[PDB]
Design a protein around this ligand. Structure first.
Ligand SMILES: [Zn+2]
Ligand SMILES: [Zn+2]
Ligand SMILES: [Zn+2]
Ligand SMILES: [Zn+2]
Lengths: 56, 49, 53, 56, 49, 53, 56, 279, 44, 66, 147
């Protein structure tokens, strides 16, 4: 991570055929082509945290 | 003139075995005259490689 | 056992196809790429003779 | 500061010990408890202290 | 239907790499503990974080 | 198996051999067949023998 | 640095992405094995009771 | 204090409970009820993936030397200070004996198991009034043979005294007193492949020699008193039964063995050449 | 039939210490028991 | 290795003409282009398959295991 | 395809493009820890070990090995160990019977599954019971491969 980007939140539509999937829009602030780079994911546990991720 | 010479044989064989196993390049002296990448594991993926 | 072609090509009988309509561009659904001429930079269809120029 | 810092405390007389969690025995998986660096060095400290006290 | 443009298209030589997906897929929740630090342990092998 | 090839390799090699297919309407799919494990109505049986002579 | 201002975590995912032109920005595509592996706590209200019972 | 944790489900109590471990989540659950007992298990393999104390004893050995970010002026002081505490322990003599049996076993090219078993045999007694010194090498010559034989490896006396001249009888009395020590604290068939190794023969003579040694052990004619030698003449009669020139003078100089005993065994198996061949 | 050890197509039937170095062969590597038991496969 | 079955490009049965394609080199001294002509695959999509297959199963099988 | 992604023909994958072998090996051997008696490669019974896994140990045979050619899942066991100490109050002290296991049987890596093949056993440098196995596993190319 370099700046305020790379930290997006998302909703989820669950997909088969195991891998991730995302929009072609947000690719350049993510600063990653599809050359095999890997992602990192986290899930909140309580509602204050889930709400502030959702709203910010 | 026999008892010492065969443990001498162990020292020379064990030293060469340790050197070409580890890649620490020197005797049992904890990396003196030390440079590492001399005993790489051979690359065995593809004939070209 | 039985099987069908749509889930696996083991039961495919076809394994070839050919498909042609308007060999002479009369419907003009697409142009041709060219660098100096549309005609000489392309070959005629084998199906040429059954429809007039 | 008198209440917390007075230079005779700055010279070491009586030495506390660290608890077993900071220096844990790794239980080295065939027969050993696998004693580690901190307990090893403390055992050296006790040996040297008992040697000095018998000598004096 | 007919396609508007035209396509450069034909035979070419490719090859296959080593980093396949099954060695890289990895996920974890409430697993093993490291005795020195009480944190999740390392390694995809022993189900790390 | 004894060859210098392996077994599922021989299987996928076998999978592409086509067969006679006239009366294929007469038999039934195993998914719709009431039986279990390849009755004569729903499947056929194949035997192969080779030797190192 | 490796234990206080950063450390290991829980509820984590790590795979490789592919693009898609049919999912908008606030979604993300998540594989179902990972969705089996992960979790999220909820609470029991009069509102969520039947859906939660069915999912149990 | 009784120093004891027992794990029991607080809702089943059928026995010391039939419980399982889920190491993939590090938890324990009573399999009947399905409730947890405790959580956050400690790994039992990762420490062996991370990195001779029984022979070095409770006190722990430490060799000291030099490094990169140090000075020669005080690492030579360290090199002359490393012997300032060797007299506090008898472990300097234990490790001197360990070094010397390492000298001996690797001199006779003996493996790691033979080395560690000789280390065990010294560490077993290491101090008795029965030991009483006895040149300090007789105890090691005994211990290496004890560890060799208990490693199911046979080595000759002639090999042992080719290694160290222990006058063969201080060695013998040391072997007797060690035999009594081990029995308080509580096989010649493998000589044959080393003999044919030094003679360079294929398999069928060796298998025939083993079969004839078994049969002659069963029947009669000890006849040589230390039947090592009648084993040796069983190899002699096998190789003379075949047609490879391994003549008696060559065998005697090779094995440092009496040729008259070879002719005596040759006569007593010349009588008994009948029932000793299978094919 | 328990051991093969070599280029022989012989069912040597070795169990415990009957000259492990093979008699009608010349090997000390002791090939082990291709299985009589029926196998299952899945060719989808 | 083994010349494969059912061409990726076309999909017809391939390898019938394989040892045929062999024996039209040795006892005929025949050039490969007219040899593929008479062999009779008028597409190229299968012509490449036999063109760039390399045998390995001969070098495989001239071991003597078991 | 965008930013160097790839579209492929699963029908060509069905026809047999890019299929691949995968050999994996294992190193395992025994030790002397006494009172010189070494470990054993035993087939565990129910009352055999200390702290048994959930390996469902039926895939092993009387020599403590797995016969080749059968299939294995991820968690399954292939080798069997037993602690030869001798002397540590061998099978009646501080444990049930379940004699002297402290069992360190090696399971397979818990994800990949396939067919074991051609198990060899041969003594080591000093002479012990030293074991290597090999497992064979097909991997059809999937969505997430680096090409
Ligand atoms: Zn049926
Ligand atoms: Zn319970
Ligand atoms: Zn053989
Ligand atoms: Zn084709």
């Amino acid at each position: 991570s370099l700046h305020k980007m790379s930290m997006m939140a998302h909703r989820v539509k669950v997909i088969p055929y195991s891998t991730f999937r995302l929009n072609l829009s947000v690719t350049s602030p993510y600063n990653a082509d599809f050359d095999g780079d890997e992602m990192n994911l986290h899930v909140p546990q309580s509602e204050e945290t889930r709400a502030e991720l959702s709203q910010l | 003139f026999n008892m010492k010479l065969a443990i001498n044989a162990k020292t020379i064989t064990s030293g060469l075995k340790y050197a070409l196993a580890t890649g620490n390049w020197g005797e049992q002296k904890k990396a003196m005259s030390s440079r590492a990448g001399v005993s790489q594991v051979l690359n065995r993926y593809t004939y070209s490689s | 056992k039985k099987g069908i072609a749509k889930e696996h090509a083991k039961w495919g009988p076809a394994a070839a196809i050919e498909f042609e309509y308007d060999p002479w561009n009369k419907l003009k659904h697409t142009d041709y790429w060219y660098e100096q001429d549309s005609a000489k930079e392309w070959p005629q269809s084998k199906n040429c003779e059954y429809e007039d120029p | 500061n008198e209440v917390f810092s007075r230079p005779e405390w700055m010279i070491l007389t009586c030495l506390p010990v660290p608890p077993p969690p900071v220096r844990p025995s790794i239980s080295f998986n065939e027969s050993q408890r696998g004693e580690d660096d901190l307990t090893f060095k403390l055992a050296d400290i006790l040996k040297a202290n008992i040697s000095l006290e018998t000598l004096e | 239907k007919k396609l508007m443009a035209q396509i450069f298209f034909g035979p070419t030589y490719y090859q296959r790499l080593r980093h396949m997906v099954d060695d890289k897929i990895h996920a974890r929740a409430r697993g093993p503990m490291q005795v020195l630090t009480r944190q999740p342990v390392e390694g995809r092998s022993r189900d790390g974080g | 198996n004894t060859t210098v090839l392996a077994d599922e390799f021989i299987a996928h090699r076998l999978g592409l051999i086509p067969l006679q297919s006239m009366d294929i309407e007469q038999l039934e799919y195993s998914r719709d067949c009431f039986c279990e494990d390849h009755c004569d109505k729903c499947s056929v049986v194949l035997t192969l023998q080779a030797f190192g002579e | 640095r490796g234990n206080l201002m950063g450390k290991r975590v829980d509820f984590s995912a790590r795979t490789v992405i592919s693009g898609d032109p049919n999912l908008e920005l606030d979604q993300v595509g998540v594989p179902k094995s990972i969705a089996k592996t992960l979790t999220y706590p909820e609470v029991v209200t009069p509102y969520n009771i039947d859906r939660l019972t069915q999912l149990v | 204090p009784n120093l004891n944790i027992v794990l029991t489900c607080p809702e089943c109590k059928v026995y010391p409970p039939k419980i399982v471990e889920r190491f993939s989540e590090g938890d324990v659950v009573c399999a009947l009820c399905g409730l947890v007992l405790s959580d956050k298990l400690v790994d039992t393999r990762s420490e062996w993936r991370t990195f001779n104390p029984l022979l070095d004893g409770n006190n722990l050995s430490t060799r000291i030397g030099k490094g990169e970010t140090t000075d020669m002026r005080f690492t030579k002081e360290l090199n002359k200070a490393q012997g300032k505490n060797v007299m506090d322990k008898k472990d300097n003599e234990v490790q001197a004996a360990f070094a010397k049996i390492t000298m001996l076993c690797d001199a006779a090219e003996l493996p790691k198991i033979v080395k560690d078993c000789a280390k065990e045999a010294y560490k077993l007694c290491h101090d008795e009034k029965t030991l009483k010194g006895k040149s300090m090498e007789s105890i090691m010559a005994a211990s290496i043979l004890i560890g060799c034989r208990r490693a199911e490896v046979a080595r000759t006396f002639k090999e042992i005294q080719s290694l160290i001249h222990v006058k063969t009888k201080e060695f013998g009395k040391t072997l007797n007193i060690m035999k009594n020590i081990l029995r308080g604290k509580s096989q010649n068939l493998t000589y044959i492949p080393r003999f044919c190794s030094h003679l360079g023969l294929p398999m069928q003579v060796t298998t025939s020699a083993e079969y004839t040694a078994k049969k002659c052990k069963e029947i009669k004619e000890i006849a040589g008193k230390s039947p090592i030698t009648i084993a040796v003449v069983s190899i002699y009669l096998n190789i003379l039964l075949f047609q490879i020139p391994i003549t008696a003078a060559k065998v005697g100089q090779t094995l440092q063995v009496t040729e008259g005993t070879i002719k005596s065994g040759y006569k007593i198996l010349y009588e008994h050449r009948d029932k000793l061949v299978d094919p | 039939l328990k051991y093969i050890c070599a280029e022989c197509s012989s069912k040597l039937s070795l169990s415990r210490t009957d000259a492990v170095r093979c008699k009608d062969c010349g090997h000390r590597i002791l090939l082990k028991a291709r299985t009589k038991r029926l196998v299952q496969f899945e060719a989808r | 290795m083994i010349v494969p079955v059912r061409c990726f490009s076309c999909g017809k049965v391939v390898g019938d003409k394989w040892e045929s394609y062999l024996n039209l080199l040795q006892e005929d001294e025949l050039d490969e282009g007219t040899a593929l002509s008479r062999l009779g695959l008028k597409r190229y999509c299968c012509r490449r398959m036999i063109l760039t297959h390399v045998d390995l199963i001969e070098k495989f099988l001239r071991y003597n295991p078991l | 395809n965008q930013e160097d992604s790839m579209i492929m023909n699963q029908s060509s994958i069905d026809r047999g493009l890019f299929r691949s072998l995968f050999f994996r090996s294992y190193m395992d051997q025994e030790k002397k820890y006494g009172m010189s008696i070494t470990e054993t490669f035993e087939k565990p019974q129910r009352t055999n070990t200390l702290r048994m896994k959930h390996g469902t140990y039926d895939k092993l045979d009387d020599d403590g090995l797995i016969a080749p050619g059968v299939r294995v899942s991820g968690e399954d066991v292939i080798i069997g160990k037993t602690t030869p100490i001798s002397p540590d109050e061998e099978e009646l002290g501080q444990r049930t019977a379940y004699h002297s296991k402290r069992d360190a049987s090696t399971p397979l890596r818990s994800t990949e599954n396939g067919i074991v093949d051609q198990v060899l056993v041969t003594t080591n440098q000093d002479g012990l019971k030293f074991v290597k196995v090999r497992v064979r596993t097909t991997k059809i190319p999937q969505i997430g491969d680096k090409f």
